[PDB]
Amino acid sequence: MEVRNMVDYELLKKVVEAPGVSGYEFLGIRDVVIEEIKDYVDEVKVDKLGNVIAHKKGEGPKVMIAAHMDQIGLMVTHIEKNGFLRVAPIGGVDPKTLIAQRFKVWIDKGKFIYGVGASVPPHIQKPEDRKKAPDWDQIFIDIGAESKEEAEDMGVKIGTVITWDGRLERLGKHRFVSIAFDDRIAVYTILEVAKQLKDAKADVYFVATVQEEVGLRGARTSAFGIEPDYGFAIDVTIAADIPGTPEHKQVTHLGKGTAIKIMDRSVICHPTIVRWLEELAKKHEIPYQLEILLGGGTDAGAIHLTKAGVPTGALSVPARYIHSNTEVVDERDVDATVELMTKALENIHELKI
Amino acid sequence: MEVRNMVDYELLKKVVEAPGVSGYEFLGIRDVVIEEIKDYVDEVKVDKLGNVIAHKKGEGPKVMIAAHMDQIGLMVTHIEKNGFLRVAPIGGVDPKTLIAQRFKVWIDKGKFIYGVGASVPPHIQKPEDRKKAPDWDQIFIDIGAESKEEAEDMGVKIGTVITWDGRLERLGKHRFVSIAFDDRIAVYTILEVAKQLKDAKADVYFVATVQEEVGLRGARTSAFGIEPDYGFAIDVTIAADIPGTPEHKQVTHLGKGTAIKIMDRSVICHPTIVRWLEELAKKHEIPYQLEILLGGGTDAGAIHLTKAGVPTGALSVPARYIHSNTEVVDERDVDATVELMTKALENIHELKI
Amino acid sequence: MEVRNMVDYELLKKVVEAPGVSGYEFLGIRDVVIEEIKDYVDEVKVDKLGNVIAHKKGEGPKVMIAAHMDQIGLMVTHIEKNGFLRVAPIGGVDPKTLIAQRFKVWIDKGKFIYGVGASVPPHIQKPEDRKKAPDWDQIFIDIGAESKEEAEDMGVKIGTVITWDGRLERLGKHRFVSIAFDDRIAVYTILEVAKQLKDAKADVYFVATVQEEVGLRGARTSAFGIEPDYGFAIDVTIAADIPGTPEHKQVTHLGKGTAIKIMDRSVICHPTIVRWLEELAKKHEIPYQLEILLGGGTDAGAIHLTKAGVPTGALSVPARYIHSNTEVVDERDVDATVELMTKALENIHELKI
Ligand SMILES: [Zn+2]
Ligand SMILES: [Zn+2]
Ligand SMILES: [Zn+2]
Ligand SMILES: [Zn+2]
Ligand SMILES: [Zn+2]
Ligand SMILES: [Zn+2]
């Protein structure tokens, strides 16, 4: 569990279990996040996009910290005549992982039924048989209903209703958390920062955006008013020590320290900030890694689209996986990000250049 | 839950949760099965192959009922230098389903750690990328260990250690059980029969074989002494109402009644028995379906390999799925099999021809 | 030569040179094996299948040790009009290795002529040219005859007549034997065990089966009466330290210690026995390796098909190769198997569970 106690098992659990997709019946997560942040922040407001803005009052430059909380999911597009639930693809999800088992379909907030639809109708052809990759039709999920009417009675209606579902378990008693890696974590890092934030050298606005994995632009909207005068965002992706993988990708992750995003698809970290963070980490002896991604966009990049033209830095939590099959995290990694980020906040007054 | 109460939720749960692979640390299931059967049978003995033989004393022909309890699993073949656990294929498992999440690796009886290894190293090629089907190398499972030494310390040793793992949930509040379909169910049907068996017109030997999904022959060995003078075995497979599927396969399953195996890969049900069971079902108004399989072998077929040359009939529980992604069952189906089988037992004296 | 003297050079030579295929003109090997075993066993009998049963009299459980001695070969199917000898495929032989040179065609016991037929008629096509893999027609062997009549005069008649042929040489003066790996070796291990067997805690029946590489079932027949009450069989296969080979296969063999078969295609070693042997090896400080195979069947598995339902363990001699091109063995490996097996025999009384 809390091997280092750096990450509370309870906080990680509450956030990871909460449904993803704010504003959606999965919105329970939105309420949860604000439930705890309000205790350590002067106030929290809900934006039009459902974005949550936490306001830390202090003197200094406005630093915006943005964490994404869109997670991933699947949307039912219609009900088959056989009472089977169909699904529509979402982005940030790989069809190859489609679904293997246990899917949570939310009929309503607090009302969900287990559904499975890991298998898609077999293709015809001995070679196509080899093709185990499902077609764009994706896969279908069965609510167990026998008729479309029954499915409707179940309360299944068009609109994203299904979430990946999973369980938080500890892998490697020495360290490592399961589905804690995406979804929540960065949000967890933001919560921890607020908790340990005492002397505010600079006031920090915490913004949790939605639709970050898809429609990241919406996240930018919250960033628009809060992100002015600097901002940081935390998303994570990793090529990590996998067999058959070249060293060039292994360097992407090592399961140690933390990762500072040198550049991403949408944000080329302002060199001073990237370089500066590196300096800061060494001074405090905080472990860090330099990670560059060839693809993927972060909310930080979205912040870069603000008309303010504010530079953005990014922090990364190494030990990335994809949500569909895994989401292993490094306990140290979550801690490393929080520690580095917290110190950086005070330093930001000088750090702002 | 017990919508019809035909299948107790508790009994189904205990059997499905028990690990699969008797004699193996998964052997906990073996003990469980005998734990309950001993109360309703005069005695239970453990064979050399770990097969369990329940002896119902009565007067009449010896009828052997055989249920398989091998389930499916994966075996670690070695420990990678990176501390990753590797796996070796088992039979009755489809690589395409490989593993999506949460895998249970048993270090010892009662000691297991969660492991994940749903993803296999990406292939090189834009088209091979489409190929989402993993190679024979199969997939690898990470125990979260960082070093082979650590993995060994974890207690991971060569030998099948991993089980699919899953959770028993109710799908369709109207009916349907998740991972209850394979593994346990038929065994459950056998237990229920014993429980409701009161007046024994004929003595019935209940044999639970192991290595049925693989090395079905071993199951035959138990059948060798017990199966003499008739025997029945229950395994299940279904082509069931799936979209894009031709009607010719839909007829295989309908999620109603039960299924009598007309013929399988290894057993051509003795026509009299198949026909006879049909007659019996109609007389008692028990729903039934005639199912023929083009492939797959049942333990009943294995019984057919006895030197006695005893004919074997087979009962099937419709609503088949594969263990890797699903295992939906029909509550009615479990009930239908039990009801039909129980009545058949007494009728067997006349029925034996 | 006898670097450790663990394996006599003379015994290895006599067995490896003897022709393979008992009952066949290659049957000379059958006589040889019984020639030496009779001196250390109370008696030897020839079964109907040509199987040889050695009877070690002692008190205790009956332990059956089975070694295969079918080797591999090729059968002439007809005589071409050009006087060329044709061949039919055998199983356990890879066409790709077909034949490179020097083939021994037995016209009669003690009468053989050298024949070559490493090349098969070239295919037509610049790309098919690349295909160096011969077709199912396999390859043809020339007895040097110019006419079918001459070939017949030579005494070439339909029926497997040809053996791979080879020479026993020492590779690596430090250790390693050539064509000693398959064919003979396990048989050699059985002979050595009998020789060093003095105090018989348990009586051991030694059975040498035939048609093990093909028609392994026949081997089971001898096992049927002798294998009752436990049995062990030794066959070998290796993925061994080959370049371009992944570590996951390298672990299969290391050219050190011996290999205990955890599971094979047909036998899932009884866990207690596998585990037990491991315990025994450590106690006596005998080197061992755990090897699992994804394919291949061993005679031990065949023993598992006995109606007795007797559990079987298996010992493996690492450093496997295929008979067609190589058959390198580790001298230590042959010794390790013998040492471990001999101690196990006495322990078997307690070991039997
Ligand atoms: Zn994501
Ligand atoms: Zn993310
Ligand atoms: Zn199965
Ligand atoms: Zn089954
Ligand atoms: Zn061979
Ligand atoms: Zn062999």
Residue numbers in the entry:
A (entry chain A), B (entry chain A), C (entry chain A): 1 to 353
Paper text:
We apply the integrated NMR/EM approach to the dodecameric 12 × 39 kDa (468 kDa) large aminopeptidase enzyme TET2 from Pyrococcus horikoshii which forms a large hollow lumen encapsulating 12 peptidase active sites. The dodecameric assembly forms a tetrahedral structure with ca. 12 Å wide openings, one on each of the four tetrahedron faces, providing access to the ca. 50 Å wide catalytic lumen. NMR and EM thus provided structural information about TET2 on very different length scales, but neither of the two techniques by themselves allowed to determine the structure at the atomic scale, owing to the lack of long-range distance information in NMR, and the inability to build a robust model from the EM map.
We use cryo-EM maps with resolutions of 4.1, 6, and 8 Å (the latter two were obtained by Fourier-space truncation), as well as secondary structure and distance information from MAS NMR and solution-NMR. Despite its large subunit size of 353 residues, larger than any protein assigned to date by MAS NMR, we achieved a near-complete NMR resonance assignment in a reliable manner, which allows the residue-wise determination of the backbone conformation, as well as hundreds of experimental distance restraints involving the protein backbone and side chain methyl groups, but by themselves these data are insufficient for structure determination. An automated approach that jointly exploits the EM map, NMR secondary structure, and distance restraints is presented, that allowed us to obtain the structure of TET2 at a backbone root-mean-square-deviation (RMSD), of 0.7 Å to the crystal structure. In the first step, after detection of the α-helices in the EM map and in the sequence, the various possibilities of placing α-helical sequence stretches into α-helix density features are systematically and combinatorially tested, performing with each of these helix-to-density assignments a restrained-MD type structure calculation with CYANA. Subsequently, the correct helix-to-density assignment is identified through objective criteria that compare the resulting structural models to experimental NMR and EM observables. The refinement stage of the protocol, an automated iterative procedure denoted here as step 2, consists of iterative cycles of (i) a flexible fitting of the initial structure into the 8 Å EM density with iMODFIT26, and (ii) CYANA structure calculations. In step 3, a real-space structure refinement was applied in the XPLOR-NIH software, using the full Coulombic potential map, first at 8 Å, then at 6 Å and lastly at 4.1 Å resolution, and all NMR restraints, calculating the full dodecamer. Figure 3 shows the evolution of the structure from the initial model to the final structure, which was obtained with high precision (bundle backbone RMSD over the 20 lowest-energy structures of 0.29 Å for one subunit).
